[PDB]
């Protein structure tokens, strides 16, 4: 991001529902978990274009 | 003082353009530079070509 | 002579000492650190 | 689907005039109307009568700006037949402006369109040719 | 002589709310000192 | 002092400036491929994480 | 305005774009702008005058369709993906979206014409804040997503604004609206530089800011806002002269100050990537600019006009206003050019 | 542009990886020019609020000059570090892709025909 | 060379604390050892050029620029010391601050060697220029005069920076000689075309050929002593002097991208030295020959012969020095009269009999009188031209005709009439003024003996 | 009612600065400060700088080599002269070492 | 007391020093090439230090 | 100091105002009793009396207090406005407005030891009473409706911020009267007013003043004999009330914000030397710039206070 | 789903245009801002509820108050405007153009 | 050679600045322009995908 206060203090307050499949409440998952997991450990390690 | 005013800068203001004037501005602004030019330019090529051809005596033109 | 002699009328100690202290420390600080880094420098350096 | 706009550059300048025209007079109506939406959404008039005969003085003066101008540029390069080198494309440029200043009833604004519009188009040109990209893609 | 310094004549060509009134349309008024109006 | 001592000063300098050059005229290359391919580094553009997803089991087999 | 209240409200203004910026999420985003919306209204309409009312009402109601475009843009996104988060995989109509809304919040052209009313109807010590931390955020947002924008529109929008702010500043003597064109002409400039690199922007708008703040500080001093009215300072203060007229200088973008460097690697750039044309264009429209600061150099130094007589019994008087982060800023703008690598 | 490289150890002013680069010798010319900076800047304080110039506020003047050379000082150290940084990634990339830099070794003025130019 | 600048960069804080009755002596007479230890840079034993440093740099085409700056220097401070004598002492001392700025950018310029550092300075120049130009004159068009100067001055400068750009991006480096190793030719087309155009815009906006020599006059008569010295001797120099250093690398297009600017310059000469005729103003007559002698400059610029070179060096420093002369003149004979008119003051040179001999040194060197550098000048520029065509030789003598012509009619209508008789305020001649001719004159005479300093890059 | 002019100090007079300090020479008012001041253009302008600057130049020596070059050229037409070489070849690189295409 | 006046002629002597002075450590630097160059490369005479 | 800080502190201003601690007019015309009467006033009621603000007030309270050259103070002559009016010089109002500006101080510095601390104040004419003066030069003749204009202008900017007085008395005697009390001071300028000045005066008191300001503060319409007996009038002003007026509908923060604004010695001024252009006060630059040179050349006004050397002071070197 | 949500956004591009556009009050602009708000509240919560995300949900309940704010100071606003001027037209802000 | 270049751009530049400050303060007619804006930017992204 722009300002990585948070990474700094390692924490986190908006960025852990970020996206679709994370800690949902009663465990009850959502409708693309796998396909987010996928998509998301594919385009961890590299940044962007290489993704794209 | 007054003629020096008439002369220098109470010009512009009470300047009207109209033709004629805007004539003979384009004139001495285009015409002679134009006519010089045709002439040195035909004076180079000239030049250019007798030196190609090789027979303009440059002799003793060392320095330029 | 005025009247109304105002604030400035006279010096404020607490500011001049603290203003003069804190630079000295500054300096202080400075040559310790850059002392340290030299220091580290040469040592990672040879 | 943009062809209206980039057959301009399917031949190269030369014929095809009736082609080329049509679209200069095109690109007239369209800078006509958004000018003419800009100043009637602002400093607006009494009746939409005036207003769209604002609009309509608008449109049609550019539309004959771009026709005589894509005509002069196409006539030109048939005639001197020296098509790429842009002086077609500023002379054609400066017969724009004329036309202007004609509408307009100003010889200065005339001239004035001339210099300014005739210079513009030929470095249209030079881009054209020369690859000089116009709102470009970032590759540093 | 002396260096001629500006005068109300220069400087009142400036008063007005907006320089450069070519138009008719520039027939407004200044602006108050205080940002009040009447 | 002698000419010698401009003289390769002069030297040294064109040597600085040379080597300058070539590394600015490399340095464009470099971060034009880097910004076009993203083989490097550099323009690492931002994605998305992932240490907060979940891999326990999620009260249905499904999802 | 008691204090419990003005502490508050500046604690707010001084948030939302703290969250605007360390937040990760569009809708903490979007927060952090309505946050500094809010908190600001009042410090404009503290009067109660109707000239402020009325530029509250104006302010209020642009920034509130910008903040809902931009919502719709996030929600598009959303549906569109799942996150919360922009990538590199969305209709470029939802960015031109969001950048339309960012620059009506901003004051870029043509959605600019809102920004000298308010400045004219603010006073000083908020009119600073308005054209100095409310900019910040929006252009945040875009420094997070520089890469995957519309350069086109980007630097149609930015040599729009700098055409217009310069025809408008040629006008204009109310010196707050002077302000306002350029802060439009510079954040033109920003968003021209922005797509090929940001900390450039971030280096123009801090340059802009050191420049602004100081001349504002001038001003609060005598609420002198008017050309005729701060002609005056070579018989009330003749002090302050020989900096405002270097800041000027400098906000024009003369070589040996500051304000020129910006301009100076921005046309770098450009000309790496080959934008030549546009940079072109933006070098031979900041003219302008320098010129409606240059005819303010001659009201106030190179020539001194005719002062009011009453100015005898203020000068018998004294002033003790003038902080010292004035000058400093003022310096470390006009003569910091040498430590321009050291900027970068 | 290059805060996602990697480890770009975050919201850290000068990482421990910075204490094996020279540091400024304190006779610097940018330190000095930021000391002349707060010199001025002092003397311009005292003119605006009307004060004697250079005889006055020596203890602002001792201020200002010590904090601008205290900031200066790590500042400057960051900028190094960040050219180094630049420097070595350059470099890296290059070592690791070759081919896209064919070492060109130019010819001499024998063989390469340098066109003419008269007068 | 910083041996040059700092002293330079410590007459300030001397002139600021200095006390009113010794500031003008002491700054002075410094300046004076400054411009003594300007002199190093002629050890120029053999032809390995001088380097300092990656940021400085001297050269035969540099050094006399140096010298003369930072001679006019003292000059400046000295002609501009009987006016302003009622403005207030932190007022001179501004003057002074200003003018000891332009001498340090002026040094800083024509020593360096990237462009880019000459460009910074070269627009730098402006801001005291204009100053003492609006703060300082003795009317009201001043202003606009200002605005002109500055806005022909960067009009000029932009598309230079620009260009600039595009060679440090497609070339690596800017350093001259440099450039010159590692030069290389163009396919002369349009882009390389308007490239030639956007380097030498500027310089020649600045070294003012017929088309935009209106910024010249106005200066040179609304503003002072000081920025009409200064104007007529260097900050046209700075034009010639980078026009000079960068066409080295847009061969071959100076061919044919010469001509207009060459039949321009040459009419220009010839008009305007027929209105030094006509022109009332005494100072606008001063300015025109200027513009006249500068035409001649360009036209021997541009074709690039070495000859050329060196009579365009030898013409520079001339008009630099003559025009500064003239200038204190004028100035002189305005202070006890005020008013620039040529007819008013008529048949001197029976109450200034010397000041007279200090006038017609200078026309004579004006009109081309040898043997002075002036003529070598105007002579092996006129060869160079007669070289690259035999039609020019025309222009060349009309335009010595003319000059031959107007310098006189000046001589004859302030110093060979009959004296009025309502001018009582004629204060004799001023040991100060006296002087500053003397000073103006004598090192004409010592480089007349010896020109081979003079002469630039070519011998 | 007819009208009123901005009250402005009226037109200072022209004066003599003979008439108080014949002595006079042009620089100011105070004759101790003016006699100091051009003693001090005076030698500082005349008796150094023209003086010596004319001595260290016309004692400089071989300006850009043109004693050098001259005694070089004596010396090689000399040997030239002597060995049959002509004094000028109108091919000043080796024509050997060079190549060229077809 | 006299010095509050005549001390500032003590600038610019001190201004040309620190010249000479600057000039002499960048000379200083830059002694890459000291002798490696291709026209004037001695052999060091014995009790002739380095230029 | 009073920033925000002091207040938030405690040093508040209702905790100090306490009762007589209130404001107070004694207008009327020029020779009634109201010098004597305002002392007897000030005398009984502990408050603090200000003098008639003339000409020399910002150089009597400012640096040494000594009455200043007319150059640096105004330019205006009193003596030379009885004696010549009408003339091509503006007298009249580069004059009036002088004198507005300098009771505008008055009343400044009185609301600031008001607000400091509540020991009440006593004014003669103020700003509320310094416009009927114009109104006469206008009827008669002495002045133009632009002028006129200006002072107006003037009037609505600075007026309104500031809180109106409490207590207003008015003199009420007429020209015959007025003249015998003239002539029994004795004066070759006073002596040469007219009847019709006095009259235009009276005139616009009785119409406008009154009639205006009985409506947010006390008035008290008193004759010659009855102010000859002051003591009455004291209990007169005891035993009355103060309602209908702003003073309370004021607090803690509009006191404060209103006396930051005060203590605020220029942004009193900054609307009444705005630069609008009349050749009666409209000063050139040369003028000014002497003007200037020559006040920052006096001793005490080169520097600012606590910094001029020359006068006396010491540890110059540190603050 | 893409049917009614598709309907949705053209109602939001309605408001748009009634807040782009005016009638001579302000009123109608506020409304046509609520209007907005309700269309954007309602497609987020139905991405959410078909998505079977919960997490997300938080985000309709923040922005709903947030625009309940909002339009809280714009009705203050419009009635300091009334209060000051007359009435709440807009034809009455013809101020500041100077 | 005034009227040609300086003056031109004077009145040319005179002319665009009363233009572009002709406008009155009426948010009636700013919408609208930010409409015509907006239309303008859905257009161009739509031609040129
Ligand atoms: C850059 C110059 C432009 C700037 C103008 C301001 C000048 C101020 C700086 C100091 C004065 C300029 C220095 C001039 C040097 C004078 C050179 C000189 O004295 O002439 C040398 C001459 C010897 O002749 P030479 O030309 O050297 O060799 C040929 C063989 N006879 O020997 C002589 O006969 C000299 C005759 C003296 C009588
Ligand atoms: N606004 C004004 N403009 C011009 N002159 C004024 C103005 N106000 C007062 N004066 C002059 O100043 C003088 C003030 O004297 P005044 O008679 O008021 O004394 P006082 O305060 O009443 O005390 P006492 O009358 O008991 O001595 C009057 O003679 C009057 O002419």
């Given at each position: ?52 | ?6 002369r ?52 003793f033109?060392?320095?330029? | 002579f ?45 | ?24 007079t ?77 509408r ?34 970032p590759?540093? | ?15 007005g ?22 | ?47 998305p ?15 | ?19 605007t ?22 410090m ?15 302010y ?11 919502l ?56 600073l ?12 947002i875009?420094i ?53 690199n ?47 007229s ?15 460097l ?74 910091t ?8 | ?27 610097d010319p ?19 609020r ?60 024998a ?9 | ?83 302003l ?80 750009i ?32 956007a ?14 020599h ?60 027929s ?8 100072k ?21 012969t ?13 008009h630099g ?65 007669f ?53 103006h ?19 | ?6 009250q ?43 003086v ?22 004596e ?13 000028m ?14 | ?51 | ?19 007589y ?34 000409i ?7 640096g ?36 507005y ?19 009440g ?34 009037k ?62 006390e ?101 | ?16 245009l ?81 | ?39 303008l ?6 031609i040129?995908?």
């Amino acid at each position: 991001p722009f300002l990585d206060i948070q990474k700094k203090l390692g924490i986190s307050l908006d960025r852990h529902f970020m996206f679709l499949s994370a800690e949902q409440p009663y465990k009850n998952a959502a409708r693309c978990h796998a396909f987010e997991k996928e998509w998301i450990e594919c385009a961890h390690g590299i940044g962007g274009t290489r993704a794209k | 003082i007054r003629w020096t005013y008439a002369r220098s800068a109470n010009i512009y203001p009470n300047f009207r353009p109209t033709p004629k004037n805007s004539l003979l501005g384009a004139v001495a602004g285009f015409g002679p530079l134009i006519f010089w030019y045709y002439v040195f330019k035909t004076d180079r090529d000239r030049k250019e070509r007798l030196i190609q051809e090789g027979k303009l005596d440059r002799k003793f033109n060392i320095s330029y | 002579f005025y009247v109304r002699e105002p604030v400035n009328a006279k010096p404020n100690w607490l500011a001049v000492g603290l203003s003069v202290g804190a630079s000295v420390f500054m300096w202080i600080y400075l040559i310790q650190t850059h002392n340290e880094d030299v220091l580290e420098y040469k040592r990672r350096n040879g | 689907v943009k062809r209206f706009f980039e057959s301009y550059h399917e031949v190269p300048d030369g014929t095809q005039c009736h082609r080329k025209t049509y679209i200069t007079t095109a690109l007239g109506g369209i800078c006509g109307i958004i000018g003419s939406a800009y100043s009637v959404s602002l400093n607006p008039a009494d009746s939409t009568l005036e207003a769209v005969a604002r609009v309509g003085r608008y449109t049609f003066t550019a539309a004959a700006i771009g026709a005589m101008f894509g005509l002069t540029t196409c006539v030109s390069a048939q005639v001197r037949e020296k098509p790429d080198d842009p002086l077609n494309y500023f002379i054609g440029g400066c017969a724009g402006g004329l036309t202007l200043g004609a509408r307009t009833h100003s010889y200065g604004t005339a001239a004035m369109g001339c210099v300014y519009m005739g210079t513009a188009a030929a470095l249209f040109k030079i881009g054209k040719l020369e690859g000089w990209e116009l709102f470009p893609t970032p590759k540093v | 002589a002396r260096q001629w310094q500006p005068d109300i004549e220069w400087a009142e060509q400036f008063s007005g709310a907006v320089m450069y009134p070519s138009k008719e349309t520039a027939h407004w008024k200044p602006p108050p000192w205080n940002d009040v109006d009447i | 002092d002698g000419p010698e001592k401009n003289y390769e000063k002069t030297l040294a300098i064109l040597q600085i400036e040379s080597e300058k050059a070539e590394l600015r005229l490399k340095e464009q290359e470099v971060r034009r491929l880097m910004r076009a391919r993203g083989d490097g580094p550099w323009y690492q553009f931002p994605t998305p994480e992932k240490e907060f997803i979940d891999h326990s089991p999620k009260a249905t087999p499904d999802n | 305005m008691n204090p419990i209240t003005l502490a508050i409200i500046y604690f707010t203004i001084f948030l939302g774009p703290v969250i605007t910026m360390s937040s990760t999420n569009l809708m903490l985003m979007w927060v952090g702008l309505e946050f500094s919306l809010l908190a600001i209204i009042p410090m404009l309409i503290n009067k109660k005058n109707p000239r402020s009312t009325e530029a509250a009402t104006k302010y209020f109601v642009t920034q509130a369709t910008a903040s809902m475009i931009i919502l719709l843009a996030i929600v598009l996104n959303y549906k569109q993906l799942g996150t919360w988060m922009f990538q590199q995989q969305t209709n470029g109509l939802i960015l031109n979206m969001t950048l339309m809304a960012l620059s009506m919040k901003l004051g870029l052209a043509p959605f600019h014409f809102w920004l000298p009313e308010v400045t004219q109807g603010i006073p000083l010590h908020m009119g600073l804040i308005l054209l100095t931390w409310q900019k910040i955020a929006p252009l945040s947002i875009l420094i997070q997503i520089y890469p995957l924008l519309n350069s086109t529109i980007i630097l149609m929008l930015a040599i729009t604004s700098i055409f217009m702010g310069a025809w408008g500043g040629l006008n204009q003597t109310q010196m707050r609206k002077i302000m306002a064109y350029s802060s439009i002409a510079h954040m033109g400039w920003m968003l021209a530089i922005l797509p090929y690199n940001p900390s450039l922007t971030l280096l123009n708008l801090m340059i802009y800011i050191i420049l602004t703040a100081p001349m504002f500080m001038a001003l609060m001093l005598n609420n002198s806002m008017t050309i005729n009215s701060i002609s005056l300072l070579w018989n009330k203060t003749p002090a302050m002269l020989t900096m405002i007229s270097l800041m000027l200088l400098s906000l024009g973008g003369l070589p040996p100050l500051t304000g020129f460097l910006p301009k100076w690697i921005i046309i770098t750039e450009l000309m790496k990537n080959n934008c030549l044309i546009m940079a072109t264009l933006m070098a031979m429209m900041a003219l302008l600019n320098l010129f409606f600061y240059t005819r303010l150099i001659y009201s106030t130094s190179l020539t001194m006009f005719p002062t009011n007589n009453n100015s005898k019994m203020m000068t018998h008087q004294t002033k003790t206003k003038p902080n010292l982060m004035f000058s400093t800023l003022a310096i470390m703008s006009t003569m910091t050019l040498p430590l321009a690598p050291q900027l970068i | 542009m290059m805060n996602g490289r990697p480890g770009h150890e975050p919201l850290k002013f000068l990482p421990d990886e910075a204490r094996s680069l020279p540091p400024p010798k304190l006779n610097d010319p940018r330190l000095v020019y930021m000391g002349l900076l707060g010199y001025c800047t002092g003397l311009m304080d005292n003119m605006l609020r009307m004060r004697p110039v250079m005889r006055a506020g020596l203890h602002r003047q001792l201020l200002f000059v010590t904090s601008f050379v205290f900031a200066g000082y790590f500042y400057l150290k960051r900028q190094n570090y960040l050219y180094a940084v630049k420097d070595h990634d350059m470099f890296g990339y290059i070592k690791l892709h070759p081919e896209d830099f064919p070492e060109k070794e130019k010819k001499t003025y024998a063989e390469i025909l340098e066109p003419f130019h008269p007068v | 060379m910083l041996k040059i600048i700092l002293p330079s960069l410590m007459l300030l804080p001397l002139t600021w604390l200095s006390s009113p009755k010794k500031t003008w002596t002491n700054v002075t007479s410094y300046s004076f050892l400054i411009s003594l230890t300007s002199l190093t840079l002629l050890w120029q034993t053999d032809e390995n050029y001088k380097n300092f440093s990656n940021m400085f740099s001297s050269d035969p085409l540099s050094t006399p620029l140096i010298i003369l700056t930072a001679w006019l220097l003292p000059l400046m401070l000295m002609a501009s010391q009987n006016h302003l004598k009622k403005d207030n002492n932190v007022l001179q001392k501004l003057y002074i601050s200003m003018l000891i700025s332009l001498q340090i950018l002026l040094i800083m310029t024509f020593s360096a060697t990237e462009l880019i550092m000459f460009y910074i300075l070269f627009e730098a120049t402006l801001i005291p220029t204009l100053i003492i130009i609006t703060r300082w004159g003795n009317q009201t068009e001043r202003l606009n005069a200002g605005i002109y100067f500055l806005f022909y001055t960067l009009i000029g400068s932009i598309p230079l920076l620009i260009a600039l750009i595009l060679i440090q991006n497609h070339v690596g480096t800017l350093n001259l000689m440099i450039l010159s190793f590692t030069t290389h030719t163009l396919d002369a087309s349009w882009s390389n075309n308007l490239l030639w155009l956007a380097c030498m815009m500027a310089f020649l906006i600045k070294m003012p050929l017929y088309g935009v020599h209106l910024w010249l006059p106005k200066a040179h008569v609304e503003a002072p002593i000081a920025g009409s010295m200064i104007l007529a001797a260097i900050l046209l120099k700075l034009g010639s002097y980078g026009m000079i250093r960068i066409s080295i690398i847009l061969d071959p297009l100076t061919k044919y991208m010469a001509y207009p600017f060459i039949l321009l310059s040459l009419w220009g000469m010839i008009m305007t030295s027929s209105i030094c005729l006509r022109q009332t103003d005494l100072k606008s007559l001063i300015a025109y020959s200027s513009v006249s002698h500068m035409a001649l400059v360009i036209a021997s610029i541009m074709i690039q012969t070495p000859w050329s070179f060196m009579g365009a060096t030898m013409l520079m420093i001339a008009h630099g020095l003559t025009s500064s002369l003239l200038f204190c003149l004028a100035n002189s004979n305005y202070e006890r009269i005020h008013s620039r008119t040529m007819i008013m003051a008529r048949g001197l040179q029976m109450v200034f009999p010397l000041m007279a001999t200090w006038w017609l040194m200078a026309s004579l060197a004006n009109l081309a009188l040898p043997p002075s550098i002036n003529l070598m000048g105007e002579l092996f520029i006129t060869m160079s031209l007669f070289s690259w065509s035999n039609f020019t030789i025309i222009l060349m003598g009309i335009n010595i005709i003319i000059t031959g012509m107007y310098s006189m009619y000046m001589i004859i209508t302030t110093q060979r009439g009959k004296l009025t008789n309502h001018m009582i305020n004629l204060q004799p001649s001023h040991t100060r003024e006296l002087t500053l001719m003397a000073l103006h004159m004598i090192p004409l005479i010592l480089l007349t003996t010896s020109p081979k300093l003079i002469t630039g890059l070519t011998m | 009612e007819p009208t009123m002019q901005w009250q402005e100090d009226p037109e200072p007079e022209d004066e003599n600065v003979y008439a108080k300090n014949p002595d006079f020479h042009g620089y100011d008012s105070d004759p101790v400060v003016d006699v100091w001041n051009m003693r001090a253009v005076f030698f500082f302008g005349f008796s150094i700088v023209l003086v010596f600057g004319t001595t260290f130049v016309a004692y400089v020596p071989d300006y850009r080599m043109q004693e050098w070059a001259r005694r070089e050229a004596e010396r090689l037409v000399k040997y030239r002269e002597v060995n049959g070489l002509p004094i000028m070849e109108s091919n000043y690189f080796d024509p050997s070492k060079i190549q060229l295409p077809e | 007391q006299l010095l509050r006046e005549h001390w500032v002629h003590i600038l610019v002597p001190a201004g040309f020093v620190f010249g000479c002075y600057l000039d002499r450590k960048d000379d200083e630097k830059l002694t890459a090439f000291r002798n490696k160059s291709m026209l004037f490369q001695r052999e060091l005479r014995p009790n002739e230090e380095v230029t | 100091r009073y920033g925000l800080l002091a207040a938030i502190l405690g040093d508040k201003t209702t905790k100090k105002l306490h009762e007589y601690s209130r404001v107070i007019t004694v207008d009327g015309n020029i020779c009634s009793g109201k010098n004597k009467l305002a002392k007897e006033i000030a005398q009984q009621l502990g408050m603090k009396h200000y003098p008639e603000a003339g000409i020399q007030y910002s150089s009597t309270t400012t640096g040494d207090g000594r009455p200043l050259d007319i150059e640096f103070s105004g330019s205006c002559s009193l003596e030379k406005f009885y004696d010549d009016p009408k003339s091509n010089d503006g007298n009249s109002y580069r004059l009036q407005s002088w004198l507005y500006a300098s009771r505008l101080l008055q009343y400044a510095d009185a609301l600031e030891h008001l607000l400091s601390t509540g020991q009440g104040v006593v004014l003669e004419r103020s700003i509320y009473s310094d416009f009927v003066f114009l109104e006469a030069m206008y009827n008669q003749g002495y002045i133009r409706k632009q002028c006129v204009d200006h002072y107006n202008e003037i009037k609505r900017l600075t007026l309104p911020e500031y809180l109106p007085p409490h207590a207003v008395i008015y003199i009420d005697v007429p020209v015959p009267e007025v003249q015998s009390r003239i002539q029994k001071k004795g004066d070759p300028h006073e002596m040469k007013v007219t009847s019709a000045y006095l009259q235009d005066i009276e005139n616009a008191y009785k119409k406008t003043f009154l009639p205006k300001m009985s409506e947010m503060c006390e008035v008290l319409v008193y004759d010659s004999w009855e102010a000859e007996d002051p003591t009455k009038v004291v209990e007169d002003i005891e035993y009355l009330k103060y309602n209908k007026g702003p003073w309370l509908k004021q607090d803690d923060w509009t006191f404060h914000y209103l006396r930051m604004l005060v203590q605020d010695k220029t942004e009193v001024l900054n609307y009444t030397t705005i630069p609008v252009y009349l050749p009666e006060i409209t000063i050139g630059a040369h003028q000014g710039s002497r003007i200037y040179n020559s006040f920052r050349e006096l001793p005490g006004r080169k520097y600012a206070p606590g910094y001029n050397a020359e006068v006396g002071d010491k540890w110059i070197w540190l603050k | 789903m893409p049917s009614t949500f598709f309907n949705l956004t053209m109602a939001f591009s309605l408001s748009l245009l009634g807040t782009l556009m005016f009638r001579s009050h302000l009123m109608s602009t506020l409304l046509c801002l609520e209007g907005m708000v309700l269309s954007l509240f309602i497609m987020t919560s139905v991405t959410s509820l078909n998505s079977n995300s919960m997490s997300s949900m938080p985000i309709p309940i923040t922005i709903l108050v947030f625009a309940a704010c909002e339009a809280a100071v714009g009705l203050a606003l419009l009635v300091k405007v009334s209060n000051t001027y007359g009435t709440d037209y807009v034809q009455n802000l013809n101020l500041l153009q100077c | 050679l005034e009227k040609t270049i300086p003056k031109s751009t004077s009145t040319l530049h005179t002319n665009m600045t009363t233009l572009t400050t002709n406008q009155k303060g009426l948010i009636k007619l700013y919408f609208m322009s930010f409409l015509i804006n907006i239309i303008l930017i859905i257009i161009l992204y739509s031609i040129n995908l």
